[PDB]
Design a protein around this ligand. Sequence first.
Ligand code: CLA
Ligand code: CLA
Ligand code: CLA
Ligand code: SF4
Ligand code: SF4
Lengths: 64, 37, 40, 124, 80, 165, 67, 144
Amino acid sequence: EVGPKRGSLVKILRPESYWFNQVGKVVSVDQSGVRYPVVVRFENQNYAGVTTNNYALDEVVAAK
Amino acid sequence: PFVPPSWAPSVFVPLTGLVLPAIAMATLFVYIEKEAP
Amino acid sequence: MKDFTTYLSTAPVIATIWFTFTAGLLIEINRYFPDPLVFS
Amino acid sequence: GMLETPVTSAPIVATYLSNLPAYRTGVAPVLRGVEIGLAHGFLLAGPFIKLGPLRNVPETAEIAGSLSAAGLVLILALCLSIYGSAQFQSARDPLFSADGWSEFAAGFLVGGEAGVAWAYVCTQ
Amino acid sequence: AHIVKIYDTCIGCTQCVRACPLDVLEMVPWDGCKASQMASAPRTEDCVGCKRCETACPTDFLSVRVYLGSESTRSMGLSY
Amino acid sequence: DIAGLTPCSESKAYAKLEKKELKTLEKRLKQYEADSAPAVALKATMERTKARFANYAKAGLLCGNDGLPHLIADPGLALKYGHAGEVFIPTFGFLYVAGYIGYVGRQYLIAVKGEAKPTDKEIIIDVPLATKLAWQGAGWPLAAVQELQRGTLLEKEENITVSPR
Amino acid sequence: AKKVKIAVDRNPVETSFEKWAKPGHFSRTLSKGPNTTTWIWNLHADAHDFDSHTSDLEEISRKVFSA
Amino acid sequence: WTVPTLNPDTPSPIFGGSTGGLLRKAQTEEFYVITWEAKKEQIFEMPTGGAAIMRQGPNLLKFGKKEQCLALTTQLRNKFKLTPCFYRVFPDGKVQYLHPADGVYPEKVNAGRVGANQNMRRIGQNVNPIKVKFSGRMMSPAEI
Ligand code: CLA
Ligand code: CLA
Ligand code: CLA
Ligand code: SF4
Ligand code: SF4
């Protein structure tokens, strides 16, 4: 009941993220009150080769 | 009054090129190696 | 044959054909219109 | 441990080194300085005389070369002195101490210049 | 000695600890992530600055950071 | 004439240059036979050399004191004195081809972004699509302008990633 | 005393253009295709590094012999 | 678990020796000792170069720096599935034990450890360098 729906597309707002201002697919949202529950997957890898990352609720917004 | 002697280069060139550098290097080498109290 | 035509569609093969064509066109133009310096 | 080898660990080699002035303990540092200085000072004159800029002058070659060998011994004595100042500022052998090395450097200057002078006397 | 800091984006993968070639880092209990563990840097005096830990961190941006600082025999990796 | 230059057709140095090049070719010619293969090749070169010097003079180029053609780049001076073919006309000739190549490539890149695996459509070219886009690029200046006015040429500032500042 | 003799395997591999259309097939890492331009250079750098494609000495030797 | 005590008389592997061993540093500053138990005699690779045979039972080696000890530890654990431990030894005779600091290898989480050098923020939430200026020494914003 917290965070965006699984499989939906969100836009990243973390300035220090490789995918800032980019759209990714939500994989899961932790409901345990952790710091960064939202998990997002991206189609383009970052400089380390990673394609997934964890974000806080306020760091991600729905596509548009 | 100003004109230096005609032998000035014979003394100052070796002095500034061989003698003062030797003392300067010895002074600097001892200084850098010196340990704090 | 589908795979072979797929191989010909790879980047290095396409570039070789494309530049071979492009170079040939330029070479042929200068063969029939030697020394072009001004449109005229 | 360290790679054993005849050069590193041999009886004949060890005895030879133990008799050199550097390794001969029980001798005052000043005396070791003179013994070491004489040997190097005597040799130092050779190359300067034979291959110096004034080597082809009949009589000036001997004087100029030896006088340059004396100069180099003086520079080396300064190197020995300042090395002791930097290294020993605060053990078994007296040489490796602030007091010992200062005596060692002084002996090297006296021995070295004596060796250079002795080398000159051999020529003339 | 170098400076090593662990930030609250750690997911407790333990990859930084495994990567470290001088046993500078270790894992400790935590409640801020699913793994319930966080990286720690208790022995930074042995850190050499290789940054193998940063190479191994999956989070973006890194959750472990190394700031090269004052040099010493240990941090300069000397055996003489 | 312009900038102190003179027409190559009226330039003394320009005429002398042609003789030097022909003289060099003639010198090599006289060491062969009349209709041998080397002689025919040399004669062909001399014909092209004579044609080249006639064409540049006929084109109304300007020669300097060096007796070599110089080109006029200012559009006003070019159109004023009929030198539009040196730089001005070729300027718009190149831009049409350069925009053609760039526009065709951009159309193809947008086309495959909709596919499931865009990366595999870049190393392995979709030749049927590329040929289709190759022909439609002839009207790129019209299509390019209409995209600009409709506002679909540029991305939004909010959809482009940037570093911290 | 292993005798010296001719020893081969019949039809070890199939002659097809299928793998000509799948760059990077030889390596597990590059078989997935490109995501960054670094993949392209890695394809040419590791093409003839047979010893790293497979750990089988026999497979390595056969490639060397035909190369 | 209690802190092990080093036994200087522990036997050492069968090794001829090399030029990649201890230097004068070991006699003046410190050196490192690694010990472990061997199930059977086996050949392993010395981080200083060469091959050595480990005796069955206790083994002991001396290295010039910590990284060399922990490089051998990785080899023994990954291939031979052993559990080595090493110390820091000073010329005065003092012996300091480490790795495992608490008996459990750091990769495995263990209760009782206290977090160190942990910042409860992200990298992007550090202050600007101007705000830590003239603090008496060169200080990064991450330190404060
Ligand atoms: C400004 C710097 C400087 C000066 C003044 C000199 C001066 C000299 N050099 Mg040069 N040199 C220099 C820099 C200098 N050099 C540098 C930087 C290098 C390295 C690139 C060299 C490398 C070099 C070589 C390789 C050689 C020289 C040599 C010489 C000599 C050539 C002239 C001659 O025939 O001497 C003849 C010399 C004499 C008749 C004796 C002069 C006095 C001696 C050297 C010292 C006497 C000391 C005294 C007895 C006791 C201490 C007194 C003191 C406390 C006041 C002369 C003494 C040549 C030479 O003969 O060297 C010995 C030589 O072979 N130089
Ligand atoms: C390595 C290169 C080299 C060599 C061999 C020489 C050689 C020479 N130079 Mg030249 N020179 C060089 C480089 C060299 N130079 C360079 C790079 C420069 C430019 C900076 C110069 C500038 C220069 C000048 C300006 C002058 C010379 C001069 C000389 C001559 C006398 C040098 C002298 O007094 O040495 C003194 C030598 C010694 C104090 C000892 C040398 C080393 C000994 C022999 C080592 C022995 C080791 C031993 C074998 C070990 C035994 C171990 C065992 C006991 C266990 C000589 C022919 C002078 C001359 O008049 O030439 C004709 C001169 O005026 N040179
Ligand atoms: C890259 C910059 C540049 C520069 C430095 C020049 C320089 C020049 N141009 Mg050119 N021109 C340019 C770009 C440039 N032009 C472009 C992009 C175009 C449009 C495609 C033109 C179109 C053009 C025309 C139609 C004429 C010139 C003329 C001139 C000359 C005098 C007037 C002038 O432009 O003053 C300095 C330039 C500028 C301040 C930049 C803008 C220039 C505008 C576009 C043209 C001004 C013409 C002027 C009003 C004519 C008055 C009569 C004249 C005899 C005094 C001078 C050599 C005139 C000429 O032939 O004189 C002999 C002329 O009639 N230019
Ligand atoms: S710092 Fe990185 S590698 Fe280390 S535990 Fe945290 S997330 Fe994993
Ligand atoms: S920089 Fe190297 S030594 Fe320091 S913590 Fe990271 S991996 Fe360990």
